[PDB]
Ligand binder design. Structure first.
Ligand SMILES: [Mg+2]
Lengths: 216, 45, 493, 226, 32
RNA sequence: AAAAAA
């Protein structure tokens, strides 16, 4: 690519704009900053200059989407809950009109996941709230939250809107979303598995608790 | 007569299983005679 | 059914709104400022257009209250509810008797009744005025254009008018009856100053009166004559004990020095001016009332029923037509067509006269006769929405703006920048040998396993690798747990 | 009497079906029934009576609470100090309304019953039974005086009609009374001296805890104020 | 050292003694 | 950071 492949923080990669000559016509390559890069200003020969500079140690990748995107891939931080993403959460508390949780991991894109490492005994972990209307598409008005989720149960959901900078708004309306892993009696009993979409049973003690289950 | 119904246990990657449940991530290890720190029962550091 | 009083009125209703609201005030008693000076029009600002100002605006602010409202007097117990009887006034012969009866009183308690279902602007139905020793029920239907003579009492600063939530009462007074209030004392604002839990009228009749009442007849039709027993019970109950509460609240305010604030907010209520939706100020305020305070009233209708910004032209015509008929037959917009039924016209969009008549639960009378016209407005709106139906472009003009050979210049200045910067680096090679903690701190993780003899054995680094390979392979594919349950209720074919 | 200790074997055979209750615990894994408290096992129905000063939310229980906060959705009422708050809805009152809200300030005494009480959810009460003529004394308790007693003294007073308290107090004075299952007793009289006489009796009766000493205490208390 | 109980429903492919506890799983889940 | 008339 006529540009350095390996880049340490502070290493010059490519100028602001670029162009080449092919097929008897000038093709304009537009370089734009990305994750790991930062467009800054340098001075030389008594004249200002703007060039793409890597800010993270790793390899440079030049890709195009249907313009040249310059980004640096390290050998987590970039991953952050955005509208449409699927996120594994754990129920922290149950209220009557809603159910608040905390974000643990986020599903990637083509399964693999991105685990967000944080202290659960502090509160530094991202918190999210699942509305009672976002529990299931069936009968959106009247939904008993006690018979859907449970403190400690793992819930796979999808984030709708970020809202403010405190809580995320999730939903379990579709089939592949709902309580995934759970135990009997708030975790006191044995492991339970998902059979019906609105019923969770335990093939060990024969206990059956009402939850919101996803599709296997 | 008899009705045979099977269920598909939802599986998670080894690094995700640890975040989801500390006990569950331990039991899956102990079943193979191993520990989360990849050591046997009596193996020290 | 019930005959509307609009036909029985001496003057026909006018829903044209072609001219700014002109007060029906003919005689202006207790006024230090001439009527001719207040009958003019205010200069048009940016937000405020040309309109007639409040007649007693100069009288309300400038005039002083009676010095007996500023002193703490003992409460005056209300007359017995069972012993006292309400006096009905349906003729002008007994209206004059009440007028001279109110002039010898220190304070009066007045509350209005309104019906906005069979009229566009709405019509004042019942006015209940109560003194210390008697109660009155004034009919505002038959006696309407002759109630302007009550302004001698209502605009007199010597007599204290006791209302509750007069924010809508002052409007109804000046619009239909042409009445104005000078020297108002709103018990509602008084309740706010004390910090009472509920600023309603039912709470004041409970805590400071111990007369249990309830909200039963409010939206109910008051045009029905004569008045029934539970309705006339609620009618007189509003202003009966109101004078008792007036003293009790007035004593609360003086000792807490909050009386100045209540009378202040009361005057601002009394100076409220009514104006049509067309000639309303462009800036929303609480001093001017209008049926529609938004330039685009169809906006909030769409966002409520989640109507996308595409059928706005449809809901506009349906709204403007609903307002046109309502101002024609002199009816309420909801009586012509409810918002729920209008939503069915926007959501389903019936192209024929068959789909218009049958929607939801029921259909009103106004849109049933004009159902054929409604089928055309939908066909016109759908025709309109189908009639109407920059990324690299904005960048391309900027790339042709900057010089092309300059790109070769900034590249040469970039190549000469790197070669004169990072290309020059020379220093004697120094080993990374540990000085102190560099040997032990970054130590690779090792494991040991004690055998039967008690001798330490270093676990191979390959041993733990195949352990992870065995775990990750077994965890990735879990064996499906199969368990059977007996079903004696099922049978074969 | 048959005294029970936690962890001890359960005398009742697991063969015959027996309904559970307060005092006993069903193990979510081993599925064995064991006692978790100390007291007398009552078998008719299986439950254990144990001494406790702290009340816990439970369905169909009459409680006397104090409004500690007023929200837009419901009321925040504390049935006891330091315990979690309870949710009293606006529609939980007789003759309910939409726009119009019931008149209750912070500190007002309310006599209501617990409708829905989950262990992992905020409890809820309603100021109208479901139902007993809508009037079991439910509603705002005007004036009067309340007294804190243990849960043992409260339940026996409300349920058991052989308890010589309302019987012995009715002879000394005429009054209306309301007893909650959270250890709260609300008693209102005409004269203040009578209410004070009733407060001192229950205070001494709860302390000594003697069935045959009720008439003795009530005699010397009412003659003390005079 | 630690003592754990095995869970039959978590098998792949009755108490066990564990030596030298470490990480988070062996520290929080093990109460013996 | 709900409230008042009808
Ligand atoms: Mg009124």
């Amino acid at each position: 690519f006529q540009f350095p492949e390996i880049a340490y923080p502070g290493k010059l990669i490519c100028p602001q704009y670029g162009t080449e000559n092919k097929d008897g016509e000038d093709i304009i390559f537009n370089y734009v900053p990305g994750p790991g890069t930062k467009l800054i200003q340098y001075e030389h020969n008594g004249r200002t200059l703007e060039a793409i500079t890597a800010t993270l140690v790793g390899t440079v990748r030049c890709e195009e989407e249907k313009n040249i995107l310059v980004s640096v891939l390290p050998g987590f931080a970039n991953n952050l809950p955005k509208e449409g993403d699927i996120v594994l959460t754990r129920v922290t508390r149950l209220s009557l009109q809603r159910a608040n949780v905390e974000i643990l991991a986020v599903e990637d894109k083509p399964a693999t996941f991105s685990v967000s490492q944080a202290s659960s005994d502090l509160g530094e972990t991202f918190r999210g709230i699942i509305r009672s209307q976002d529990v299931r598409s069936t009968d959106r008005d009247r939904v008993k939250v006690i018979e859907c989720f449970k403190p400690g149960d793992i819930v796979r959901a999808q984030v709708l809107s970020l809202g403010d900078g405190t809580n995320y708004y999730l939903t379990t309306a579709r089939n592949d979303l709902g309580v995934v892993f759970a135990r009997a009696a708030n975790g006191a009993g044995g492991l339970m598995y998902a059979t019906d979409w609105q019923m969770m049973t335990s093939p060990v003690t024969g206990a059956t608790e009402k939850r919101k289950c996803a599709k296997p | 007569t008899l009705e045979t119904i099977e269920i598909h246990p939802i599986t998670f990657p080894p690094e995700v299983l640890a975040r989801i449940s500390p006990e569950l991530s331990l039991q899956r290890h102990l079943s193979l005679g191993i520990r989360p720190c990849l050591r046997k029962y009596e193996e020290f550091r | 059914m019930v005959e509307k009083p609009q036909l029985k009125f001496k003057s026909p209703i006018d829903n044209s709104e072609s001219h700014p609201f002109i007060p029906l005030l003919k005689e202006k008693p207790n006024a230090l400022k001439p009527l001719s000076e207040s009958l003019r029009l205010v200069d048009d600002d940016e937000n405020n257009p040309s309109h007639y100002p409040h007649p007693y605006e100069y009288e309300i602010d400038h005039q002083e209250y009676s010095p007996e409202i500023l002193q703490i007097r003992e409460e005056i117990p209300s007359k017995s509810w069972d012993d006292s009887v309400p006096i009905w006034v349906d003729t002008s012969t007994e209206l004059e008797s009440m007028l001279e009866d109110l002039k010898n009183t220190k304070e009066i308690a007045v509350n209005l009744e309104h019906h906005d279902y069979r009229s566009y602007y709405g019509i004042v139905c019942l006015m209940q005025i109560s003194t210390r020793e008697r109660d009155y029920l004034v009919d505002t239907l038959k006696l309407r254009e002759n109630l302007h003579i009550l302004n001698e009492v209502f605009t007199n600063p010597s007599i204290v008018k006791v209302f509750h939530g007069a924010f809508m009462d002052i409007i109804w007074l000046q619009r239909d009856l042409g009445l104005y209030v000078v020297g108002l004392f709103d018990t509602y604002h008084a309740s706010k100053a004390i910090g009472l839990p509920r600023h309603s009228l039912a709470y004041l009749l409970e805590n400071f009166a111990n007369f249990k009442t309830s909200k039963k007849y409010q939206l109910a039709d008051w045009r029905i004559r004569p008045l029934s027993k539970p309705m006339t019970a609620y009618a007189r109950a509003d202003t009966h004990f109101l004078l008792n509460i007036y003293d009790q609240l007035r004593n609360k305010l003086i000792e807490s020095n909050k009386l100045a604030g209540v009378l202040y907010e009361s005057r601002n209520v009394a100076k409220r001016r009514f104006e049509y939706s067309k000639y309303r100020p462009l800036t929303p305020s609480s001093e001017v009332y209008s049926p529609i305070e938004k330039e685009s009233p169809w906006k909030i209708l769409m966002y409520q029923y989640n109507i996308p910004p595409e059928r706005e032209v449809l809901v506009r015509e349906l709204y403007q037509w609903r307002d046109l008929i309502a101002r024609r037959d002199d009816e309420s917009p909801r009586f012509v067509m409810p918002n729920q039924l209008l939503a069915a016209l926007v959501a389903y969009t019936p192209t024929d006269v068959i789909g218009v008549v049958s929607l939801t639960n029921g259909v009103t009378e106004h849109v049933r006769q004009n159902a054929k016209l409604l089928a055309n407005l939908i066909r016109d709106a759908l025709r309109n929405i189908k009639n109407t139906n920059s990324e690299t472009k904005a960048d391309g003009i900027l790339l042709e703006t900057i010089s092309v050979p300059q790109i070769r210049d900034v590249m040469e200045r970039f190549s000469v920048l790197c070669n004169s910067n990072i290309s020059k680096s020379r220093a004697k090679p120094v080993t990374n040998s540990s000085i102190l903690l560099g040997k032990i701190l970054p130590r690779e993780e090792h494991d040991i396993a004690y055998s039967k003899d008690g001798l330490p054995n270093k676990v191979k680094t390959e041993d733990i690798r195949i352990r992870a390979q065995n775990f990750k392979s077994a965890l990735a594919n879990l064996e499906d747990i199969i368990f059977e349950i007996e079903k004696p209720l099922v049978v074969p074919v | 009497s048959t005294f029970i200790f936690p962890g001890d074997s359960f005398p009742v055979d697991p063969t015959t079906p027996v309904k559970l209750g307060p005092g006993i615990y069903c193990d979510p894994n081993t599925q064995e029934i064991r006692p978790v408290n100390t007291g007398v096992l009552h078998v008719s129905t299986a439950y254990i009576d144990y001494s406790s000063k702290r009340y816990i939310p439970s369905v169909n229980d009459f409680v006397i609470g104090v409004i500690i906060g007023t929200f837009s959705d419901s009321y925040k009422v504390s049935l006891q100090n330091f315990s979690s708050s309870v949710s009293l809805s606006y529609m939980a009152f007789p003759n309910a309304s939409k726009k119009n809200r019931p008149t209750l300030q912070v500190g007002d005494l309310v006599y209501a019953r617990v409708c829905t009480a989950e262990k992992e959810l905020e409890a809820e009460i309603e100021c109208f039974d479901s139902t007993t003529g809508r009037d079991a004394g439910f509603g705002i308790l005007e004036d009067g005086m309340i007294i804190d007693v243990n849960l043992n003294f409260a339940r026996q007073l409300l349920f058991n009609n052989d308890f010589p308290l309302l019987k012995v107090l009715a002879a000394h004075t005429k009054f209306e009374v309301a007893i909650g299952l959270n250890g709260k007793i609300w008693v209102k009289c005409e004269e203040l001296s009578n209410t004070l006489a009733c407060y001192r009796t229950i205070m001494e009766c709860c302390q000594k805890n003697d069935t045959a000493a009720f008439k003795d205490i009530a005699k010397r208390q009412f003659k003390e104020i005079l | 050292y630690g003592i754990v109980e095995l869970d039959p429903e978590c098998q792949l492919q009755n108490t066990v003694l564990i030596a030298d506890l470490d990480t988070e799983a062996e520290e929080t889940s093990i109460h013996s």
